[PDB]
């Protein structure tokens, strides 16, 4: 379970929809030093509590926008975490993936989808006809 | 034919050359251009390459054929 | 009937002409590879595409400026 | 090449392909693209500098003195 | 005053001065010699 | 020989237009000029043919006059642009016209047909293909 | 999902990672550039295809490329 | 003590050094051009003062100084109209024969045959027939000779120089502090009592002492030379008493509250003057006098420096639950509290409201001037009457779009979430999906039940089934509520029984009460409303609601949406957020203004088309000696306007005969401009239907040719930005379409009006 008190919000029309209950939902939790007013990602203003907060959001981009552009940039809050919640109750923490923010290099992270050449050396599509391999995926 | 016929054939010549210009430029730039050197890796019909590098609306070769139909109709 | 038949076959011709260059652009991306066409006449066209496009642009500009200009003068 | 050299870009996908830039610095480590080249003309993104390898450059004028 | 001289050399200012000067030249040519046509230029008035 | 164009002074349709024209500056002298010098169609309006060895100066004078002026403007701009390349801030020389440089470029452009011929013969007119920015093929 | 590839011309400026609105990118240790780091795209399932990363990339040509592919609910940016 | 004058001395030196530094106001533009995009950015950000600096005080000073500059521009333009009406006009000839002379104040030189545009406007004069109504306005002001117009032209130039010096003085010498600009109560008191109130009183003085005496003589039939100069009515009090006996009593009735004595020159008649067709000048004098008292009284409403008055902050902070009406308490327990912060800091929010109200004012001007013609010989001048309505309708539409545009700018730039916590502004944004979804639905309902019934009428008429049409002779749609209002307003003056006994004639003859004719032409007559008027009015309801939908969605979603949650960080004006999320083209609030401009054009085009056809069909015309009226289009609006084939044939095709056949005549300029508007409209489609990616690649090949000849420019040629291409497309689109209608309206009215 995810602990925290929801920010003071009187309700809005930009909240969760059927997708939250059917496919997936996201939760962003953070700790603030004081009670202050922030902007909800989908319009309106809410008041984050004195202690640790918990906000339910429809999309992952809402958490990155709120945590990145408001919590960190404006309120100097650096401990926000984003979870993906499934209808079955399974919850996984997805941001920051390994406890370190992605923009800061961290040891043990592998190279994913790295092409060992400059982009101008991608093969022509005519060479890869009927093979199902895109030019950017070619070895 | 008189002077009135002279001018309209030059209007037709203008239409033929511009419609050819739009089509030929799209065909010859299908592989890529300075704005998008790797256009061939994106296929014939894609929307754009984003607002970066100044903006790339109607940059695919398909878009040139789309623009050429307007000139062919004209 | 004469007007219908002429307009019918000219508009169809214009659509076919657009398709010829549309699938020419598709040929460049999907079916053309520079290795098996190295140095041939097809490769030479791609190597002076700027001259072709710029001169087509000049013909279009010359025709458009003077044909429209003479219309509005009249 | 070296600092102050006037070079011609050979990278095909570069905005300055077959254009001329000025070498600003060369990295002595083993990185892939050690040479920094500055250009008078900005590219479509407004950038006037890029990293190139030695084989992607053609020396056209030695540095002064 | 040198700043005003520098302003007068601006591209829009020079374009306006050039366009106005050329427009005046063409306008006076219409007033002095109206109706000039191809096959008529530089021929004496009948 | 052409028979569907006749001199305007011998076209009854043209004479009808001449008689019915308003008596103002715009029609008094121009109509007289058209009558003596222009060839009119069956509609009574002057037409410009290109099938006459005679009145060839009527074709070559307007063509040569324009080509000299257009070449004069083009050579003024080209020589001015080439002179600003060596400057530290060539872009600043384009939104701020350099009067001493523009006057020098305009003065030389008077003899542009000779200068263009010399540049073409000396190879200075055009830049080499491999030294011009191009896109990947 | 969209496909995001990083090429060897990357200079490790971290600008693409900072610009990503859905945290698709992270910076991983590397040795091909002076910054000793390179961009990676471990979470392309969350990529929406906005191409903010390409806009932020300072190299010429781009060190990071986004190829729009199969559309999913989260790639279409759908809150419903 | 609180309201005071605080300024800074010589805050900005007066030097022309920055004149030679283009783009100095912007940090990015100050470095100089590298591409041609720099040139466009310089002009696009020229007057975006809040991006030049973040100092609100410096911004406000720029607003104040620039406003003096725009006042100088208006005064130069006004001086031009008065000077051209005094030097190149047939104004004196028109004043003698108003009903038989066409007003003209523009004369062209004779160099390329353009002197054909000097039309035979009567009075032994050759020139372009003007449709601005300057002559009718000047006659109502008592002006009778070109010398008086010449004096006003000189005075306008002097005022232009004074305005120009004021802007320089209040920016470079004595620039007020930010505290000065924030005096809401003082500004309202001075602008209500001192600007509107004193101006109405001053103009009432001009009317009573100059306009009424001169116009009374003119309407009596005396010659221009026999009318004494306006100052003679002030010096020689005997003349003024002959015209109106009550001036023999002087100022005594005013100070004794015996104002009924003044009823001879402060009339309350209603209707129109039979001689000229305009409103009674005595009626307008009492109207403006009543306005002056009402505005001056209104100018003592706000508390400035003496305790008495109302406070904006106290009023706003009180308008909340549970202080509201019981059915109006839904605005929440915060209500209008916090809105005062908006007006302290946001210039764009005030510009949004004020532009909206100029749209409201100009719409009232258009509607109320045709139905209640305020100037002599204005109603019968059909060319001027159509032009005045059309011009002010178009000005209103642009102002309304501008109000929505700067409302979106306020949301992106000046809106602060901390200032709006559960207040009405915050609550509106929190049910924006409620508002937009209902607005989207009502737009579809209006479109189906206004336009699709026109398509129903076209199909029924084509089938040869007129009985199944929506028409007066078929399935009737009577606008009973509008018909009821006309009956109520006619019965109010005596022409829900006699609710306005003091007005003799009907307030407007458009509602009923009779017909007024002046020179054998109809000035005003009852405008009956039938099924055709029901359909066209709901067309207006549909088009307006959709224009609201486009603009109001942009304002409500300017901060962001479910698609792009951080549009506020992207700014007010940005092209997109990439092809991702399926494609986010034209999400910013700026493109909602861009899309809303087209819908404003579409809406207002049908408004002026509805006016032009209905007036030509059911109001305007010629009256014979027997009182029989033959209208300009013979009453075809009722049966032809119910289908859009009838609009295509009987309005667009039929009424364009004048402009389509205007070659080789004085109206040939309208014919040329008719084709000019069509060209620019088609030209704009190139920018709207295409994208800069194609054009940038095309420029690459063109740049290659210039590079080949060593003539490539240092300032690199760039295709227009994505937003710039949209701006160019919409600008040429609206210019082309409006010019086409302008030539269409003016050519027809200059021929048959
Ligand atoms: C009775 C006093 C008074 C009057 C008449 C005005 C009038 C005006 N103010 Mg203003 N203002 C006042 C007091 C007054 N203000 C005070 C006390 C404050 C401080 C709170 C302000 C703060 C203020 C701001 C911040 C701004 C204005 C602006 C304006 C102009 C709005 C544009 C318009 O409607 O054009 C009306 C058109 C006219 C031609 C009106 C005449 C213009 C001249 C200058 C008035 C001269 C009248 C004077 C008594 C001389 C009379 C001579 C004769 C009749 C005896 C207008 C001229 C705006 C503007 O455009 O500034 C330039 C603006 O941005 N005012
Ligand atoms: C009192 C009225 C008023 C005032 C003070 C402003 C002030 C402002 N507006 Mg605004 N606006 C208004 C009315 C007003 N507007 C109206 C009525 C509309 C609806 C059309 C708009 C729509 C609008 C948009 C969409 C935008 C602004 C923006 C701006 C800001 C920057 C100004 C700018 O870009 O320079 C103007 C610079 C130009 C180059 C414009 C000149 C080109 C015009 C369009 C051509 C006009 C054609 C001509 C009249 C007829 C043909 C001419 C002939 C030669 C062919 C500034 C705060 C911009 C901004 O960033 O705001 C923060 C912005 O994006 N406004
Ligand atoms: C304006 C251009 C034009 C004109 C005048 C014609 C004229 C003709 N076409 Mg035609 N055609 C054209 C363009 C044109 N074509 C194009 C561009 C296509 C490619 C799609 C075709 C495809 C086509 C086919 C497949 C056939 C014709 C046929 C005909 C003939 C009989 C139909 C007729 O009376 O005229 C046509 C009159 C019109 C008013 C054309 C518009 C008709 C509809 C309303 C257009 C919209 C289509 C639909 C409603 C939208 C999708 C659903 C006639 C000679 C027929 C034929 O050969 O006769 C035996 C036939 O079978 N045409
Ligand atoms: C014999 C002639 C011929 C043949 C065999 C093809 C074959 C092909 N073309 Mg092609 N084309 C042709 C003529 C032809 N074309 C002409 C004349 C033009 C110019 C207008 C084009 C323009 C064109 C473009 C621009 C593209 C193709 C593409 C393609 C390929 C995929 C087809 C597709 O998108 O799915 C089937 C597609 C449809 C069924 C389209 C829906 C119908 C369209 C919208 C017309 C609207 C219908 C209209 C209202 C009524 C028509 C009658 C009705 C019965 C349909 C395919 C190999 C595409 C491709 O290769 O992608 C890389 C592509 O992008 N073609
Ligand atoms: C009426 C509509 C219209 C017009 C006039 C044009 C005109 C043009 N298009 Mg175009 N286009 C249009 C609609 C139109 N388009 C639409 C709807 C589309 C579909 C999106 C396209 C798609 C399209 C493509 C894809 C291409 C063109 C191209 C061209 C150019 C080639 C013709 C030429 O050089 O003539 C000469 C130029 C003209 C006739 C333009 C008018 C010049 C004016 C009259 C000069 C007046 C000067 C005067 C001082 C201005 C007054 C001051 C003012 C600035 C305030 C030309 C600028 C081609 C191009 O750029 O090649 C060079 C090209 O590749 N267009
Ligand atoms: C400075 C002078 C100059 C010169 C010598 C050229 C030369 C050329 N241009 Mg070009 N061009 C120029 C300015 C110039 N351009 C400018 C300012 C523009 C922006 C409107 C263009 C836009 C342009 C296009 C879009 C195209 C060309 C093309 C061409 C080529 C053949 C057609 C032609 O002569 O253009 C005819 C001229 C025009 C099309 C427009 C130019 C007219 C402007 C108003 C002249 C300005 C002169 C300048 C202000 C004088 C300053 C000098 C002073 C400082 C001393 C040729 C290499 C064509 C090409 O590549 O064909 C191979 C082509 O498609 N040009
Ligand atoms: C309700 C206001 C009102 C009305 C109905 C009139 C009516 C008239 N004036 Mg007048 N005038 C007014 C205010 C008004 N004036 C003010 C405030 C001044 C300056 C202080 C003047 C100065 C003036 C002059 C100098 C002249 C006139 C003239 C005229 C006549 C010509 C028709 C006309 O102007 O359009 C009618 C106008 C309207 C129907 C509407 C415009 C009036 C204002 C803008 C309404 C504002 C309401 C606004 C939209 C709502 C604000 C928001 C809200 C929260 C408050 C007519 C009788 C002329 C004449 O000779 O008379 C015969 C003339 O020469 N007027
Ligand atoms: C607001 C502007 C204004 C101005 C400048 C004047 C100015 C004048 N009025 Mg006047 N007046 C006005 C408005 C104005 N009035 C209004 C609104 C009314 C209607 C109540 C009157 C009704 C009025 C009467 C009845 C008389 C004057 C008279 C006068 C003159 C002498 C008054 C005096 O000095 O004591 C003087 C020229 C007197 C005069 O000399 O008559 C010509 C006179 O008998 N006025
Ligand atoms: C004539 C062309 C045309 C038409 C019909 C529409 C239609 C519509 N536009 Mg639109 N638009 C147009 C041109 C047009 N636009 C242009 C040129 C622009 C550029 C500025 C825009 C920009 C624009 C915007 C920005 C917006 C719209 C909106 C709308 C919708 C308004 C709601 C409505 O009227 O529902 C009623 C539907 C109609 C009146 C359409 C005609 C229906 C016909 C008459 C009846 C059909 C009978 C039957 C169903 C047919 C079934 C047969 C079967 C075989 C298919 C509607 C779908 C708005 C919207 O979506 O709000 C809800 C909106 O926000 N449009
Ligand atoms: C045509 C077009 C262009 C090309 C237009 C450009 C590059 C602007 C060209 C402006 C010129 C240089 C202005 C000057 C033109 C005058 C007519 C020149 C007067 C010359 C005198 C001698 C008469 C775009 O860049 C574009 C971008 C995005 C969406 C649509 C479009 C688009 O439609
Ligand atoms: S506006 Fe242009 S660049 Fe942006 S998403 Fe649309 S097509 Fe692509
Ligand atoms: S923005 Fe480009 S250069 Fe910078 S880290 Fe990302 S991929 Fe590498």
């Amino acid at each position: 379970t995810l602990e925290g008190q929801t920010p003071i919000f009187g309700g809005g029309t930009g909240g969760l929809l059927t997708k939250a209950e059917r496919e997936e939902k996201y939760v962003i939790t953070w700790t603030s030093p004081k009670e202050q007013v922030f902007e909800m990602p989908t319009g309106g203003s809410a008041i984050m509590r004195q202690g640790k907060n918990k906000l339910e959001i429809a999309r992952k981009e809402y958490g990155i926008a709120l945590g990145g552009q408001q919590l960190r940039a404006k309120f100097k809050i650096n401990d926000y975490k984003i979870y993906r919640v499934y209808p079955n109750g399974e919850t996984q923490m997805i941001h920051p993936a390994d406890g370190v923010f992605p923009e800061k290099v961290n040891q043990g992270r592998p190279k994913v989808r790295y092409v060992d050449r400059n982009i101008g050396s991608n093969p022509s599509p005519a060479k890869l006809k009927f093979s199902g391999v895109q030019p950017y995926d070619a070895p | 034919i008189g002077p009135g016929d002279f001018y309209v054939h030059h209007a037709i010549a203008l239409g033929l050359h511009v419609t050819t210009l739009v089509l030929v430029k799209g065909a010859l730039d299908a592989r890529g251009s300075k704005l998008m050197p790797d256009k061939k890796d994106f296929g014939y019909a894609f929307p754009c390459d984003g607002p970066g590098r100044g903006g790339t609306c109607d940059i695919s070769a398909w878009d040139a054929s789309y623009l050429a139909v307007f000139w062919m109709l004209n | 009937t004469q007007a219908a038949l002429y307009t019918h076959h000219q508009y169809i011709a214009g659509f076919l002409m657009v398709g010829a260059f549309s699938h020419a652009g598709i040929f460049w991306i999907r079916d053309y590879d520079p290795e098996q066409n190295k140095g041939n006449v097809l490769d030479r066209m791609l190597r002076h595409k700027e001259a072709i496009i710029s001169h087509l642009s000049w013909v279009s500009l010359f025709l458009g400026f003077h044909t429209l200009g003479l219309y509005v003068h009249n | 090449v070296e600092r102050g050299s006037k070079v011609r870009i050979l990278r095909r996908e570069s905005y300055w392909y077959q254009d001329v830039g000025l070498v600003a610095s060369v990295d002595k480590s083993g990185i892939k693209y050690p040479v920094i080249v500055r250009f008078d003309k900005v590219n479509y993104a407004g950038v006037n500098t890029n990293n190139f390898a030695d084989f992607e450059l053609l020396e056209i004028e030695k540095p002064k003195a | 005053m040198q700043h005003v001289f520098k302003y007068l050399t601006l591209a829009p200012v020079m374009a306006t001065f050039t366009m106005v000067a050329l427009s005046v030249v063409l306008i006076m040519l219409q007033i002095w010699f109206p109706g000039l046509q191809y096959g008529t230029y530089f021929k004496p008035t009948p | 020989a052409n028979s569907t164009l006749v001199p305007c002074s011998k076209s009854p349709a043209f004479q009808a237009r001449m008689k019915n024209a308003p008596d103002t500056y715009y029609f008094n002298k121009p109509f007289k000029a058209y009558a003596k010098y222009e060839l009119c169609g069956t509609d009574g309006l002057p037409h410009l043919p290109l099938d006459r060895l005679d009145r060839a100066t009527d074709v070559l004078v307007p063509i040569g006059l324009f080509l000299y002026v257009a070449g004069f403007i083009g050579w003024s701009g080209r020589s001015y642009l080439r002179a600003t390349k060596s400057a530290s801030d060539p872009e600043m020389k384009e939104i701020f016209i350099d009067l001493p440089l523009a006057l020098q470029s305009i003065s030389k452009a008077v003899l542009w047909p000779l200068l263009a011929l010399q540049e073409f013969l000396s190879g200075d007119l055009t830049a080499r293909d491999e030294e011009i920015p191009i896109s990947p093929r | 999902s969209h496909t995001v590839k990083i090429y060897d011309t990357c200079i490790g400026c971290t600008q693409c990672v900072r610009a990503c609105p859905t945290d698709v990118l992270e910076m991983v240790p590397w040795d091909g550039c002076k910054a000793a780091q390179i961009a990676s795209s471990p979470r392309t399932e969350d990529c929406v295809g906005c191409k903010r990363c390409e806009t932020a990339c300072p190299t010429d040509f781009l060190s990071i490329r986004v190829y729009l592919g199969a559309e999913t609910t989260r790639s279409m940016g759908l809150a419903y | 003590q609180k309201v005071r004058v605080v300024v800074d001395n010589d805050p900005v030196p007066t030097s022309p050094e920055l004149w030679a530094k283009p783009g100095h106001f912007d940090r990015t533009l100050a470095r100089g051009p590298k591409t041609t995009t720099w040139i466009w950015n310089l002009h696009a950000n020229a007057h975006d003062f809040d991006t030049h600096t973040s100092d609100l005080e410096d911004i406000s000073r720029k607003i104040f100084a620039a406003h003096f500059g725009h006042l100088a521009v208006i005064f130069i333009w006004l001086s031009g109209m008065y000077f051209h009406g005094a030097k190149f006009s047939n104004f004196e000839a028109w004043m003698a024969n108003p009903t038989g002379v066409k007003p003209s104040a523009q004369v062209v030189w004779s160099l390329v045959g353009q002197d054909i545009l000097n039309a035979d406007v009567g009075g032994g004069f050759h020139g372009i027939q003007i449709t601005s109504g300057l002559f009718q306005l000047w006659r109502a002001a008592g002006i009778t000779n070109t010398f008086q117009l010449y004096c006003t032209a000189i005075g306008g130039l002097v005022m232009a120089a004074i305005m120009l010096f004021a802007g320089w003085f209040h920016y470079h010498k004595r620039a007020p502090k930010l505290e000065w600009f924030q005096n809401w109560e003082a500004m309202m008191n001075h602008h209500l009592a001192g600007l509107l109130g004193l101006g109405c009183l001053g103009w009432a003085g001009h009317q009573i002492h100059v306009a009424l005496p001169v116009n009374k003589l003119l309407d009596a039939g005396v010659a221009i030379k026999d009318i004494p100069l306006p100052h003679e009515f002030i010096l020689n009090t005997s003349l003024m008493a002959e015209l109106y006996p009550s001036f023999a009593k002087g100022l005594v009735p005013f100070f004794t509250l015996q104002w009924g004595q003044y009823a001879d020159f402060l009339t309350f008649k209603g209707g129109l003057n039979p001689v000229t067709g305009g409103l009674w000048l005595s009626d307008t004098a009492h109207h403006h006098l009543a306005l002056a008292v009402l505005f001056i009284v209104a100018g003592h409403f706000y508390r400035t420096n003496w305790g008495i008055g109302h406070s904006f902050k106290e009023m706003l902070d009180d308008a909340k639950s549970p202080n509201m009406l019981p059915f109006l308490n839904f605005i929440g327990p915060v209500g209008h509290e916090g809105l005062d912060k908006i007006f302290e800091t946001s210039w764009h929010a005030n510009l949004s409201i004020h532009l909206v109200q100029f749209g409201t004012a100009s719409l009232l001007v258009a509607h109320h001037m045709y139905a209640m013609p305020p100037y002599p010989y204005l109603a019968t001048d059909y060319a001027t009457a159509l032009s005045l309505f059309t011009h002010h309708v178009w000005i209103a539409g642009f102002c309304i779009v501008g109000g929505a545009a700067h409302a979106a700018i306020f949301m992106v730039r000046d809106y602060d979430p901390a200032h709006h916590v559960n207040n009405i502004l915050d609550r509106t944004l929190r049910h924006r999906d409620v508002i937009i979804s209902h607005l989207a639905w009502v737009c579809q309902f209006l479109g189906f039940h206004s336009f699709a019934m026109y398509c129903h009428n076209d199909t029924m008429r084509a089938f040869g089934r007129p009985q199944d049409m929506f028409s007066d002779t078929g399935i009737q749609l009577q606008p009973i509520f509008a018909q009821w209002i006309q009956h109520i307003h006619t019965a109010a003056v005596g022409a829900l029984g006699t609710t306005a006994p003091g007005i003799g004639a009907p307030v407007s003859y458009a509602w009923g009460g009779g017909m007024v004719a002046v020179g054998g032409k109809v000035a005003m007559m009852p405008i009956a409303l039938g099924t055709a008027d029901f359909l066209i009015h709901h067309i207006h309801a549909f088009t307006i609601h959709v224009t609201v939908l486009v603009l109001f969605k942009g304002v409500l979603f300017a901060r962001g949406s479910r698609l792009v949650p951080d549009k506020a960080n992207l700014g007010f004006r940005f092209p997109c957020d990439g092809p991702g999320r399926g494609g986010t083209c034209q999400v910013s609030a700026w493109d909602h203004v861009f899309l809303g401009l087209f819908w404003m054009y579409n809406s207002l085009s049908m408004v002026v088309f509805h006016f032009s056809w209905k007036m030509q069909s059911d109001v305007w015309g010629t009256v014979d000696s027997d009182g029989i009226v033959t209208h300009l289009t013979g009453g075809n609006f009722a049966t032809s306007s119910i289908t859009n084939n009838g609009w295509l044939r009987d309005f667009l095709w039929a009424q364009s005969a004048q402009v389509i056949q205007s070659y080789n005549s004085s109206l040939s300029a309208y014919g040329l401009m008719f084709l000019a508007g069509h060209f620019i409209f088609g030209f704009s489609l190139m920018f709207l239907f295409s994208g800069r990616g194609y054009w940038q690649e095309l420029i690459e090949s063109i740049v290659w040719a210039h590079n080949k000849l060593k003539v490539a420019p240092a300032i690199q040629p760039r295709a227009l930005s994505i937003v710039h291409g949209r701006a160019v497309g919409v600008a040429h689109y609206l210019l082309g379409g409006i010019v086409t209608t302008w030539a269409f309206f003016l050519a027809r009215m200059s021929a048959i009006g």
Side-chain angles (χ1 to χ4, degrees), chain H residues 64 67-68 71 75 159 163 180-181 183 186-187 190-191 194-195:
Chain H
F64 197 51
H67 286 180
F68 285 113
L71 286 180
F75 273 123
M159 277 292 257
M163 290 306 84
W180 186 81
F181 296 96
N183 287 283
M187 194 180 294
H190 276 81
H191 285 161
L195 180 64

Side-chain angles (χ1 to χ4, degrees), chain H residues 31 145 174 264 278 305 307 329 360 397 420 479 583 631 682 701 715 734:
Chain H
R31 292 188 296 272
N145 51 90
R174 308 271 186 272
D264 64 333
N305 261 348
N329 272 329
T360 302
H420 312 285
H631 292 125
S701 303
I715 298 183
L734 265 63

